[PDB]
Write a protein that binds this ligand. Sequence first.
Ligand SMILES: Nc1nc2c(ncn2[C@@H]2O[C@H](COP(=O)(O)OP(=O)(O)NP(=O)(O)O)[C@@H](O)[C@H]2O)c(=O)[nH]1
Ligand SMILES: [Mg+2]
Length: 167
Amino acid sequence: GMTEYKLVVVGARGVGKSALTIQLIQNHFVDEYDPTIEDSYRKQVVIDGETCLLDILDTAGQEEAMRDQYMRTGEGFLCVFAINNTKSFEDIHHYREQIKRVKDSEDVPMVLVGNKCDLPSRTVDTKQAQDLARSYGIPFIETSAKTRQGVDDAFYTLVREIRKHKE
Ligand SMILES: Nc1nc2c(ncn2[C@@H]2O[C@H](COP(=O)(O)OP(=O)(O)NP(=O)(O)O)[C@@H](O)[C@H]2O)c(=O)[nH]1
Ligand SMILES: [Mg+2]
């Protein structure tokens, strides 16, 4: 595609940032846990009639100190938590606050992603996460990288949010 969208996937360790990205790009589910330092991907897609290029940065999970470099370069952010990891959900606000500080824009293209919805051990209610997304004024998408549930939707929705912001 010709229009380029710089997407950045952030969230706590182990929530499925890489598995989501690899499902989007390569269409398979990675069962292993290989911790990320930083990985870059490219994908040509047609969204809303426009062929475009997704430049995706798959980042290292936070330990608490997100890297300013990709918070400055990224145009939109996938903020990922796991529905069986209450702490990863509580962590989200710190990630959004760090991005908003670096951007010095009150609106920043973001999508909240609740991943691992295929698991039977949910501790984060869809309600709690929806309340957060509504307060931020951003979309909330539940995903499974394993079942591919919501994966395209999460990334494509983020591109739509970037489109409204830059234009
Ligand atoms: N059941 C299930 N397991 C998942 C899902 N997404 C990821 N996992 C599993 O969770 C583990 C961590 O996933 P991974 O994508 O590596 O996480 P990450 O957020 O990239 N971790 P890091 O920040 O260290 O790079 C792996 O064993 C992976 O298979 C999902 O939707 N469902
Ligand atoms: Mg990873």
